[PDB]
Amino acid sequence: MNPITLAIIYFTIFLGPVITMSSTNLMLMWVGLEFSLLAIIPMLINKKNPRSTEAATKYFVTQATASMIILLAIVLNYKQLGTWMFQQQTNGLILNMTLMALSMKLGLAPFHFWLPEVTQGIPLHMGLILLTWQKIAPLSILIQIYPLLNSTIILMLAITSIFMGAWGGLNQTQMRKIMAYSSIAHMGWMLAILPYNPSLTLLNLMIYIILTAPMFMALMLNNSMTINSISLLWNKTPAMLTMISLMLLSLGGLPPLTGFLPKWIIITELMKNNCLIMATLMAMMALLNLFFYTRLIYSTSLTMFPTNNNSKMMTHQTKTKPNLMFSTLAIMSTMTLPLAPQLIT
Amino acid sequence: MPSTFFNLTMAFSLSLLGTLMFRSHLMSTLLCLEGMVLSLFIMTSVTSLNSNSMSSMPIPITILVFAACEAAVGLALLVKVSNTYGTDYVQNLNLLQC
Amino acid sequence: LDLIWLEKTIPKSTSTLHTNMTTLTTNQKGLIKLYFMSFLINIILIIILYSINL
Amino acid sequence: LRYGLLAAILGDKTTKKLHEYSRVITVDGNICSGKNKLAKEIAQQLGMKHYPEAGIQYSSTTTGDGRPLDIEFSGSCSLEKFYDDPKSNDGNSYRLQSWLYASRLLQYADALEHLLSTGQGVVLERSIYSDFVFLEAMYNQGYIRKQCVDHYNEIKRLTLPEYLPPHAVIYIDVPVPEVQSRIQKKGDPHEMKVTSAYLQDIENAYKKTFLPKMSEMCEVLVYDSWEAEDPTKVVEDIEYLKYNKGPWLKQDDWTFHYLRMLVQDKTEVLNYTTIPVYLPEITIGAHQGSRIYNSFRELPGRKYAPGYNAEVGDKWIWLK
Amino acid sequence: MNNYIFVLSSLFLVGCLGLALKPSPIYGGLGLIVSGFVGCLMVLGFGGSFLGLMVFLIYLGGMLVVFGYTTAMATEEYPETWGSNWLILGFLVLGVIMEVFLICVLNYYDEVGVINLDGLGDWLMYEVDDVGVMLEGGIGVAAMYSCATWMMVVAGWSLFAGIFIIIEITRD
Amino acid sequence: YPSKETAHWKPPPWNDVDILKEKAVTNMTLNFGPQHPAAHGVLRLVLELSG
Amino acid sequence: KFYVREPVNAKPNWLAVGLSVGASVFMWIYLIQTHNEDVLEYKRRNGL
Amino acid sequence: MNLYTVIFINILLSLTLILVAFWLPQMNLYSEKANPYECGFDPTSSARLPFSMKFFLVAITFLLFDLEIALLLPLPWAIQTIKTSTMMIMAFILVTILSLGLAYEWTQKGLEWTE
Amino acid sequence: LKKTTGLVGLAVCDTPHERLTILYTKTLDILKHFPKHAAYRKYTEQITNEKLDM
Numbered sequence A: 001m002n003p004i005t006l007a008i009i010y011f012t013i014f015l016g017p018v019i020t021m022s023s024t025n026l027m028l029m030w031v032g033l034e035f036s037l038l039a040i041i042p043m044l045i046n047k048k049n050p051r052s053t054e055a056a057t058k059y060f061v062t063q064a065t066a067s068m069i070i071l072l073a074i075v076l077n078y079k080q081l082g083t084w085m086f087q088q089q090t091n092g093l094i095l096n097m098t099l100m101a102l103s104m105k106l107g108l109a110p111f112h113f114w115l116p117e118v119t120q121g122i123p124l125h126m127g128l129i130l131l132t133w134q135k136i137a138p139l140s141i142l143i144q145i146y147p148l149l150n151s152t153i154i155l156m157l158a159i160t161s162i163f164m165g166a167w168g169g170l171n172q173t174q175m176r177k178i179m180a181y182s183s184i185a186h187m188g189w190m191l192a193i194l195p196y197n198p199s200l201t202l203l204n205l206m207i208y209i210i211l212t213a214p215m216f217m218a219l220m221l222n223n224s225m226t227i228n229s230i231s232l233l234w235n236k237t238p239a240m241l242t243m244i245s246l247m248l249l250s251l252g253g254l255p256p257l258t259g260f261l262p263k264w265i266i267i268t269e270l271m272k273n274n275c276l277i278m279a280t281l282m283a284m285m286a287l288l289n290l291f292f293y294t295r296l297i298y299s300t301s302l303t304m305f306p307t308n309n310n311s312k313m314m315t316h317q318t319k320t321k322p323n324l325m326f327s328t329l330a331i332m333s334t335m336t337l338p339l340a341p342q343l344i345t
Numbered sequence B: 001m002p003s004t005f006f007n008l009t010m011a012f013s014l015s016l017l018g019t020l021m022f023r024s025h026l027m028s029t030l031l032c033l034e035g036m037v038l039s040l041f042i043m044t045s046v047t048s049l050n051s052n053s054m055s056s057m058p059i060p061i062t063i064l065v066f067a068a069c070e071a072a073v074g075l076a077l078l079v080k081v082s083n084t085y086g087t088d089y090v091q092n093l094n095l096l097q098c
Numbered sequence C: 001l002d003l004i005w006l007e008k009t010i011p012k013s014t015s016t017l018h019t020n021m022t023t024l025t026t027n028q029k030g031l032i033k034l035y036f037m038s039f040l041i042n043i044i045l046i047i048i049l050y051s052i053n054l
Numbered sequence D: 001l002r003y004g005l006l007a008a009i010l011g012d013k014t015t016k017k018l019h020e021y022s023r024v025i026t027v028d029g030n031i032c033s034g035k036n037k038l039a040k041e042i043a044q045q046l047g048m049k050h051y052p053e054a055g056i057q058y059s060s061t062t063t064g065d066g067r068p069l070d071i072e073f074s075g076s077c078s079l080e081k082f083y084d085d086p087k088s089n090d091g092n093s094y095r096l097q098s099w100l101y102a103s104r105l106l107q108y109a110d111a112l113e114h115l116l117s118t119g120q121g122v123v124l125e126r127s128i129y130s131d132f133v134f135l136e137a138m139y140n141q142g143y144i145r146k147q148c149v150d151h152y153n154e155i156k157r158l159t160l161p162e163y164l165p166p167h168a169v170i171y172i173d174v175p176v177p178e179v180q181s182r183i184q185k186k187g188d189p190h191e192m193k194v195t196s197a198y199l200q201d202i203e204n205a206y207k208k209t210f211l212p213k214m215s216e217m218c219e220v221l222v223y224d225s226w227e228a229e230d231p232t233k234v235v236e237d238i239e240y241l242k243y244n245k246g247p248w249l250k251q252d253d254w255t256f257h258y259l260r261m262l263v264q265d266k267t268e269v270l271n272y273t274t275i276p277v278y279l280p281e282i283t284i285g286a287h288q289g290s291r292i293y294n295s296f297r298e299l300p301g302r303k304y305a306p307g308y309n310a311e312v313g314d315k316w317i318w319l320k
Numbered sequence E: 001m002n003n004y005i006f007v008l009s010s011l012f013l014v015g016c017l018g019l020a021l022k023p024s025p026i027y028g029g030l031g032l033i034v035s036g037f038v039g040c041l042m043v044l045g046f047g048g049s050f051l052g053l054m055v056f057l058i059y060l061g062g063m064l065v066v067f068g069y070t071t072a073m074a075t076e077e078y079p080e081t082w083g084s085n086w087l088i089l090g091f092l093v094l095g096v097i098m099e100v101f102l103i104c105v106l107n108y109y110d111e112v113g114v115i116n117l118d119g120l121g122d123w124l125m126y127e128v129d130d131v132g133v134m135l136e137g138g139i140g141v142a143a144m145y146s147c148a149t150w151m152m153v154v155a156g157w158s159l160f161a162g163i164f165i166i167i168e169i170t171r172d
Numbered sequence F: 001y002p003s004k005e006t007a008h009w010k011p012p013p014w015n016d017v018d019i020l021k022e023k024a025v026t027n028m029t030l031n032f033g034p035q036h037p038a039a040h041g042v043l044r045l046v047l048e049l050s051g
Numbered sequence G: 001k002f003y004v005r006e007p008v009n010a011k012p013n014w015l016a017v018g019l020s021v022g023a024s025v026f027m028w029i030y031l032i033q034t035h036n037e038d039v040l041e042y043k044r045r046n047g048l
Numbered sequence H: 001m002n003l004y005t006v007i008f009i010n011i012l013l014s015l016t017l018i019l020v021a022f023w024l025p026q027m028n029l030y031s032e033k034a035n036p037y038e039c040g041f042d043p044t045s046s047a048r049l050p051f052s053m054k055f056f057l058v059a060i061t062f063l064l065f066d067l068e069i070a071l072l073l074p075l076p077w078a079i080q081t082i083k084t085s086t087m088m089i090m091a092f093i094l095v096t097i098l099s100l101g102l103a104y105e106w107t108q109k110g111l112e113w114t115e
Numbered sequence I: 001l002k003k004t005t006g007l008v009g010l011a012v013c014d015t016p017h018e019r020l021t022i023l024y025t026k027t028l029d030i031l032k033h034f035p036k037h038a039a040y041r042k043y044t045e046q047i048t049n050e051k052l053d054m
């Protein structure tokens, strides 16, 4: 690489969502989305393998099409009302096109097909940057239009994203695809609670981000790609196992881990708004999510898969783990349930 | 003006259908993307000229700048695809399914 | 009962249903032509749902 | 890790610290032909750093106390047992070969780290580019199997192209009867039980594959024994060598920086040697693996990180 | 001379239909050049000429680079124009017939008033300041230099970052 | 969970790189024939060109 | 030396040690002072 | 209307000239006459194969610089503004960052026709 | 001290006495492996010896 273009690209990656979430003009939100996409593409295609090229191409055409639909919605709103924000009396067709295009930006089902494809064939840190940072700007736009959303389309997208994410993560054995389907399921939960409480989708987004940051960090430590690769972790880094298991259980939503809190409070708000059918279906598919997490836990922690001869040399060498980032986020993402009234806002 | 705006919206719809329905050519997909861009530019310019929104007249120039940036990135990715395979075929780039 | 039919009824049948449905869900090829065709079908369904519910 | 992007920005440029003798010189030959002394003398009178041939105990000598560990901590190879009986019921030949490849990979990474960090050239004995000769000799003599060969080739494909080839490859051609006579005169009872077909297999692998495939990317200095057994003509050839081919010419400060990062992180070096391909000659199993790992952690100086071991020193334990 | 803008909009619809129907990218760039010229004429008819000339120049440069790339890599031995498959021509004329059918339906259904046959050409330009200086398009695009400096700086940073982005993508 | 519709798949490579060599660049063959002004009247300079 | 290669941390990084200890002491002092100011302000605003 | 009439008159003039060129002379068409030229030999390829241009990065940079041109072109109306200090600063910044991008590409050998 | 050789592709090649010395000694050492009656050995030894002497 080169430090100058590293600084330019990473600053533009930062600047995109910041402009989107701090700008009150829909045009400036759109140019923030464009900033994020165009800046993150060279970080995706960096290893210059065919898989990286394919992932960059798929991501580019998907996000470009979705952003074009977003800009269509903005221009139609400007035609209808003369302003640059959906105020209160816009067209429901415009709002539904906005929701559909932002769903394809976010990557929730049935627009979810590219997300495991792009997450596969991409290095783990770029998968982390995608699955955490790229989902804040479209969520910021969705939170900005908090009323005047179609709850029917919202709930349909939410339920199909949770269903398809649970099934996909159940099938997959590649770790990056597992993380992508986890992303799809949690985005389904956030979108489900979006029209009733912006605070709860913000809370679920924060819980998901602080939960899947150290999961990706622990994958990044040993460059573990598959279930077998994470299975020979007892020989590589045996101190990782308890935190890995606790974070996987917290992603599953088991009490008393703090990952139970977003699902619990979202179910509470949906009970307050009388959507028991959707809440029950979402909870059962979250149990399916917990099943594929628990199979991962069986592979990596509660059993000891066979190891090979060169792991002796791996034990001979020395390692390095980031301070202030892994352990802090792991503790805050596992043992922060009794601070639930402070976490909800 | 409403007839012309209906025609421009239908032109955007046609270019969106072209973007969604692939025919073996990433370059043709990028062409459909830029057709969508041109339709949006004409819609925004006609709206601003009709409403006399001279303060909002920089909006088409902004969307043109960002659209050319995304077209630039797409052409660079097409160059990388052609270097990888040599044919530039969207069905040929498919190996991330497993 | 306890070694065939309760086992066949609740847990094994639930596992069989969900593994069939996850095979059917994750039976995708990596063709973005097919992915975008599915996205078009999604857009058409959203348009029809809006035009029906209104 | 002291070196990083910040250190490179503040200025630690490899091309700034390069030199006319900042070369990687790899000495190769058959089982017993004068290559340990030749590399020593070449490093001695070129100012390089001599790296002897990476044996079983290379990681043991380069990490920790530096004393060789047990035969179960440092692989399970037993080259003497390989010479005594190949084609054993347990996979010892391929275990020895894969462990030697990983040891040579670690040695090549150490040599590259030394060269990119200090600018001093390095003279290696039989680097990773000349280990497939031993593997192919093992396979063609029937000592290992096609699954082992495929696993080795997969690990070689995963690890080898991420590094740089040697600047110079010196080869010592020597006939198989001469190698046999030198082996018998050495007197090692295990090494005396080597097949002349095996030695001819190593030589054939060398000539057929190693010399052209390295000649297309660096320069080759094939010598005889009489051209060798005189480590001054070789040094004069190295001095008046021309380095006008290979990937050492098309790279710059930032390529050197990323290579230096990848080569100073030793776990990233040895990451692909531990792929979970479950070859029964290589995989171990949970009970033996956990017993060996716990005993290795109970070794002195190995229970914690090397800065933190009160039984061997490390007085300022509570402030770091 | 009243339905001039409607004729232009119909031509733009036809050009976008051809671009959607996806010829060889040589003819795709041709169709986009024609559509860009037609959209320039539409903007010029509706008002200021600067925006139309700008989009014309920009798309001329863009389709030129596109032509170079589809000659370089996005080409084949028999580049289909439109008549390699009769389905493409039949679908083009089917879309034309559907366009005529829909505009006739919307003329017959004159309650909403989106398209009217008798009222076409009557509501093109709504209200204009008859006496007045400096009211044409391009003054606002100049006001991007003084009143929307945020728009100016995000466009400039987009182009700068885009230079860095394309160098790093095609670094190889 | 391999089925009849996905039994032909393979696991991804560990380093996300696989061999996909074609070597089918097909450099353009152009002849400076014996009519070119640059050719000296009588020359068939067959040129393998990369652009 | 027990080790063949010098460990990255054989001596404490005294800059980091002093910075961490000083940051802890400053944060505790600032926390106690702002708690005292908060209880004083609360009592002053609503009586005692 | 005037410019439209002149455009149509020029188009009709060019069409009339090429129609005269096609219907005036005598035609004698056969296969060896209408074969592609290729300097007096049969072409080896089909002249539709990939060409592999060598200035692709320069072409993409041309796209970006053309949009920087589109940004810079409203300057004759921009200099009529009432502020003129923010206008001057903004024009300086725009030209400076365009020049910085060109300088960075030149340093990184982007416009060097990599074969 | 010499700036250029005047022939294209011929490098300047500083300290030429040592290079000529090692080339001539290598030529003599490989001529020692020829038969004593080899006229090529005799004549090439004469040429190399007189050039090394000068």
Ligand SMILES: CCCCCCCCCCCCCCCCCC(=O)OC[C@H](COP(=O)(O)OCCN)OC(=O)CCCCCCCCCCCCCCCCC
Pocket (backbone or CB within 6 Å): A284, A285, A287, A288, A291, C010, C011, C012, C014, C015, C016, C018, C019
């Ligand atoms: C008489 C009383 C009647 C009333 C009570 C009825 C309910 C009783 C309780 C539920 C039944 C028990 C469910 C849990 C046990 C079954 C799951 C199981 O054990 O699956 C194992 C199997 C994987 O086998 P594995 O070990 O990996 O393979 C061999 C080695 N690899 O796993 C698989 O193949 C996939 C397993 C998926 C996970 C199953 C658990 C989650 C179920 C989610 C339910 C969702 C409900 C809504 C569904 C959609 C709407 C219909």
Ligand SMILES: Nc1nc2c(ncn2[C@H]2C[C@H](O)[C@@H](COP(=O)(O)OP(=O)(O)OP(=O)(O)O)O2)c(=O)[nH]1
Pocket (backbone or CB within 6 Å): D029, D030, D031, D032, D033, D034, D035, D036, D037, D053, D079, D082, D096, D097, D100, D131, D134, D191
């Ligand atoms: N099977 C096997 N044996 C190897 C490999 N590398 C080295 N050996 C063995 C060959 C010898 O028995 C022993 C010592 O290697 P050398 O080639 O350095 O022999 P030695 O030091 O006796 O002679 P030298 O003066 O260096 O030529 O190690 C390898 O990759 N596989």
Ligand SMILES: [Mg+2]
Pocket (backbone or CB within 6 Å): D035, D036, D053
């Ligand atoms: Mg030796």
